[PDB]
Structure formats: C-alpha cells, structure tokens
Design a protein around this ligand. Sequence first.
Ligand SMILES: NC(=O)c1ccc[n+]([C@@H]2O[C@H](COP(=O)([O-])OP(=O)(O)OC[C@H]3O[C@@H](n4cnc5c(N)ncnc54)[C@H](OP(=O)(O)O)[C@@H]3O)[C@@H](O)[C@H]2O)c1
Ligand SMILES: NC(=O)c1ccc[n+]([C@@H]2O[C@H](COP(=O)([O-])OP(=O)(O)OC[C@H]3O[C@@H](n4cnc5c(N)ncnc54)[C@H](OP(=O)(O)O)[C@@H]3O)[C@@H](O)[C@H]2O)c1
Ligand SMILES: O=C(O)CCC(=O)C(=O)O
Ligand SMILES: O=C(O)CCC(=O)C(=O)O
Lengths: 312, 312
Amino acid sequence: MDIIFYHPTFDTQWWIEALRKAIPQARVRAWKSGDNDSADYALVWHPPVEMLAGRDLKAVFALGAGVDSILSKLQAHPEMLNPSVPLFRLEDTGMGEQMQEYAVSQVLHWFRRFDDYRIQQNSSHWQPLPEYHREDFTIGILGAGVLGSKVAQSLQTWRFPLRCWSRTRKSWPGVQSFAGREELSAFLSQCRVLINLLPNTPETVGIINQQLLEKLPDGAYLLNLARGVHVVEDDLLAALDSGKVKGAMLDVFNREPLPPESPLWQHPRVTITPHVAAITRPAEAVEYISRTIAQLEKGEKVCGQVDRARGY
Amino acid sequence: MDIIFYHPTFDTQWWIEALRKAIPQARVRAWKSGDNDSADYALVWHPPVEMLAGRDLKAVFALGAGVDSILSKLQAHPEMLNPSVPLFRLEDTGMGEQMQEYAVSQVLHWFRRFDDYRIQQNSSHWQPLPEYHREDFTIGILGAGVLGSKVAQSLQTWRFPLRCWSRTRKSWPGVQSFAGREELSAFLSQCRVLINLLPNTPETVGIINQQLLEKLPDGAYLLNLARGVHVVEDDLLAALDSGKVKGAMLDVFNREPLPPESPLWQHPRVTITPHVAAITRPAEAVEYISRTIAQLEKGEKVCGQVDRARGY
Ligand SMILES: NC(=O)c1ccc[n+]([C@@H]2O[C@H](COP(=O)([O-])OP(=O)(O)OC[C@H]3O[C@@H](n4cnc5c(N)ncnc54)[C@H](OP(=O)(O)O)[C@@H]3O)[C@@H](O)[C@H]2O)c1
Ligand SMILES: NC(=O)c1ccc[n+]([C@@H]2O[C@H](COP(=O)([O-])OP(=O)(O)OC[C@H]3O[C@@H](n4cnc5c(N)ncnc54)[C@H](OP(=O)(O)O)[C@@H]3O)[C@@H](O)[C@H]2O)c1
Ligand SMILES: O=C(O)CCC(=O)C(=O)O
Ligand SMILES: O=C(O)CCC(=O)C(=O)O
C-alpha cells in the first residue's frame, strides 16, 4: 500500500518513519504539489484541495480531533473529496487524558477559590474564605463525545454533580443526560461550571452567547476547550463585567492568535492558553491509524468515522 | 458518660448537639474556666492547661490532624495531661480528600505550564510552549502518613512517577519508599515536585532549608501543606530568586497570619493560601470520635493514637 502524508507544521520526517515501522508493507511519502502518483490512504491536516481532488482513496485520516476545517473546505470545494472516500479523525490518541488534566486542574482551582486567594495575595491580605460545597458546584459538559465523556469521568471521581448535553441521550450512570435544543435551557439552569467540548458545526456556531450565559447560575465559570466560534466574545465579556460569570478559562478564540487588542487578554477574570489544551500524541496517532487501516482491511467495524451530512 | 468540649473558634453549640445525637447516652458540655466537675472524655483544640490538669480522663481527642501544639504545651506543662491518658487526633475526617484536591490541582497547573502562560498573558503574548513529560516530573511526598498516602494515591491516577519519604518503609506498589535521614539525599535528587505532609516535631523543624533545596532538580516546585516551621523562608526565597525553584505554593508559615512585610507575598513565583488546605469536616469528625469511643468501650484495637515519645 501507498500512503501520502501532509501536515503544515508537524515533524513530517518523524511521522513517515514511524508510519513505515508500524505498517512495514507500506510505502509512505510526504505529499508535495504536483504529486499525482497513486495512493491508497491520505493522512492530512489543512490539506490543499489539490492533494485530494480526483483521488479514489480507500480512506482519509484527518490528523486531529476537530474536522470543522476540512469539512468547511469540502463544502467550498466539493471536488476535493469524492463521497466514495471515508473520512476518519483522531479519536482520543492522548487528547482524552490531556482534556482531563486541564479541566480537573482548573475546576479544582475554582472550587478551592484559588482565584480569590490570588486577588487577596496581590494586596498582601490574609483572609480565610468560606468553603464551597459540591452540591452548589454542579458541572455541565456541553458535548458528550470522546472527550466530553473522558472529562465527565474524571470529574465524577471528585464527586461533583455532573450533567451533559448532546444531540442523543447518554447512559452514564451518575451523569444527567440532556439532549437537544429543547432541553438546553434546563441543562444550563444548574451549571455552576460549564465545560465546552462541542465540535464546530453550523448548528453550534455562536451557541455561547448572551442568551445562554444569562441562563447560568450566578457566579458561574466557563471553560472553553472546543472552538473559538462557539463563544460570542463580547457577550462573555459583558457577563464577566456584570458578575454573572466569576471566571473564564479559554484555550480557543474566534481569531487565533488572539489579537493583542482583545479585552480578554487583560480582563482580571479571564485565563488564556494559546490553543494547547489537547494535541494528539504522534505515537498514539500512528497506533490508532495503523490499527484502523488493519481493521478496514479485515472487514471489522470501525466507528471513528466522520459523517459529512451531520457535520462531525 | 461525660464529655467536655473546647475549641477557640469552631461552632461550639453545633458540635455539642451533634455529639449528643451521635452518642445519646452522653452528657456533653462546653468547658469554661473553673469547671472542675467530672468528665470521661475531652475534645480539645489549643486547650488551656487548666482544662486537663489533674483529670484522669479515659481519652483526649485533639480536634485536628496536627498535634504539635498540644504536645509542645504538654512538654512545657507536664502536669497538664497524665501519662495514663491516651491522646487521639483526627485521622482524615475529610482532610484526605481536601489535600488531594489542593495537590492535584496545583501539580497539574504546573505540569501544564499554566504559570508560564499566565506570565505571557500578562503581556498579551501568544506563544505555545513545549510540553512537559511525566518522566521528568517525578513527585516526592515528604511524609507518608494518612494524608501523604492519600495525596500519593490521587497523583498515581495521573501516572506521575512517585516517591515518598518517612521513618519506616512503605509498601505502596508503584511508589518508591525512602526511609530515614540516610536516604533523604537520594529521595530528593529526582523530586521535580516536593510535597510536604510531615508533622511538626523537633526532628523535622527547618528541614526544608538551603541544603535540602539545592539537592532538588533544577526548576523544581514546592507545595508546603504541613507546618510553617518546616521551611526556612529566606532559604526558599533565595532558591526562588536563583531559578532553582520555579514555583512555590504555601499554605502555612512560620508566623500566621504571614506578616505583610514578608517578601513571599509579592514574590512572582509564590502562591499563598491562609492555612486552609484541609480543615476537618465537623460531621466526619463527630462520626470518627463517636466510633472511636465505641471501639475503646468494646476493647477493639484503635490505632489513631498519638505517641508522645516519638512526637506525633
Ligand atoms: N486543543 C483543543 O482545544 C482541542 C483539541 C481537541 C479537540 N478539540 C475540540 O473538541 C471537539 C470534540 O472532540 P470529540 O472527539 O469529543 O468529538 P465527538 O466525539 O464527535 O463528540 C462531539 C459531541 O458533541 C455533540 N454535538 C454535536 N453537535 C451537537 C448539537 N448540535 N447539539 C448538541 N450536541 C452536539 C455530539 O452529540 P452526540 O453524541 O449526540 O452525537 C457529541 O456528543 C472537537 O470537535 C474539537 O473542536 C479541541
Ligand atoms: N491545613 C493544613 O495545612 C493541614 C491540615 C491537616 C494536617 N496538616 C499537617 O499534616 C501533617 C500530617 O498529617 P497526617 O495525618 O498525614 O500525619 P501522619 O498520619 O502521622 O503521617 C506523618 C508521616 O510523617 C512521617 N514522619 C514523621 N517524622 C518523621 C521524620 N523524622 N522523618 C521522616 N518522616 C517522618 C511519618 O513516618 P512513619 O509513617 O514512618 O511514621 C509519617 O509517615 C500534620 O502533622 C499537620 O501538620 C496540615
Ligand atoms: O487544531 C489544532 O491546533 C490541534 C488540536 C485540536 O484542536 C484538534 O485536534 O482538533
Ligand atoms: O491547624 C488548623 O488551623 C487546622 C488544620 C490543620 O492544620 C490540622 O488539622 O492540623
């Protein structure tokens, strides 16, 4: 078999060699413009149209969890990827644990009032503060997928009340499952902490806006680990300035890098990371891809597949 | 039975009523100066000498995990507590989980470089940073007791390499046990994070000093959750200023409240909480005390007992 590989910034030579060793019968090459030779599988991130157009590939693997970029490019360029070609993404491959590390750390940080103690420390002021209680710190996960479930599981360990929101009902024993737009209001009503692990799709753009934020309990917290387009940043700033939202930690933004003129940078209740919440671990990704190709060859059901009609 | 209760600041009336309901055969009263009536058990925190002197109690329960204060008072006033009287403390009673919340949150905070991203955010500067790896983030727990073990267990969940230090060897399957002063140097050599959960005893005063800190790996972190006397604060500041220690989070200090002139307050790499890492949960404490008294009455082995000769 023949594999073409393309990634705009990863260690391309490292990946080729690691793919060759995991799939020794395979010829792996980096894709460059003009290369119209045969290929069975394409491993891509932000690929140019030309890499895929007209190719009858056995599969394409997007080298990330999110596929909003490749799918929006296919919408604008329907000739890029034949409907015959199955599209896969990276499920977990280390990003699950990475989202658990980020979420658990910051949820506990807020639950233990480290933000308030930092403010008081800035004035050299010693003052024990009242403890928060788990019954008032219900956590809601917007999005209940591969990463959402992982974050829910790790927070349940700490005995926080937990709820999740998705399109379809979930069966997680101690997590209250809300489903659909008709249940979103009820889901938000108790979310002391709101964690966003949704995909970017046309149905979810701008979902974290003024109307959503004002349904939250007072003194709520926002963790945006998904996509910048999910949040209307001026609406968030207004809810931070009114005291509706006590704190927001944001890893993703409508424009990346976040422009220096954004008021989010210096807002006292905002914490910013530069889109680093969860990156695939190359060796786990090479193992996921090699195992998935082997399953495709054997006719075993795989499920890590993108549905172009639903958008994720 | 008769129980006298004394605590300088807790909700005394709440505790009396809760003890009455957990031990309905018991007469519970708040101790005031001049009260020389009989008593079988004393529940105390920072008690005056007069409360205990000359009393042949069946047991005294110190209402905290640490007993350095009561034991140093008994040293200065040997008449305060007859050697006949067994002394107990609060084992866990909720403080285990509270130490896990604090430690896990801040270890993950440092592991994910949230401290560096905060510095960069202060300048509106966007810059993904290299990931740290678990093999370079060995965590050492100074003290391997009721709370030390709980913290070790919760950090093992995150797959950090783990080691502990105590007087006696431990058998925790994935935690390397170091024991005694003769093994302290070797224990420190790999501690990227040093977590202090030792008791204050004459043998441990000032143990975190210049000689200990310089045995740590470069860019180490310090979490002091135990007693302020364990740390020589000027030595810590020097290791923070030389870059030996990248960050210190401190809940306890040689003088409490930490005086405003301490350079720790405004040091950029120091985080301060006002001795709030783990407070006993009254209802768990009343359950621990009532169950321990019942076991004493039935002749069942109890072990939560202070050893006045060893000092803890
Ligand atoms: N560094 C970073 O910040 C970073 C890294 C990796 C991933 N991410 C983000 O995380 C996202 C999720 O990854 P994942 O692997 O967890 O995706 P996933 O397994 O596909 O899970 C997506 C979940 O979102 C829910 N969802 C989709 N559309 C919805 C709608 N209209 N209403 C309600 N719920 C909806 C789905 O519901 P059903 O279960 O009912 O289908 C599903 O539970 C990615 O899309 C990416 O944007 C960010
Ligand atoms: N809010 C707060 O900040 C807060 C709250 C609660 C407790 N604390 C502190 O936490 C401490 C520990 O509580 P705990 O219940 O875990 O106590 P513990 O169960 O008695 O554990 C103490 C541990 O320290 C070790 N140790 C004692 N002396 C030592 C020495 N000379 N060299 C090496 N190791 C030594 C002991 O070793 P062995 O196991 O070999 O005996 C033991 O493992 C308390 O003393 C208190 O100061 C702080
Ligand atoms: O988009 C990226 O920069 C990689 C991390 C991510 O968000 C994803 O895997 O979808
Ligand atoms: O000493 C206190 O203020 C209570 C918390 C503590 O450190 C202990 O339980 O020993």
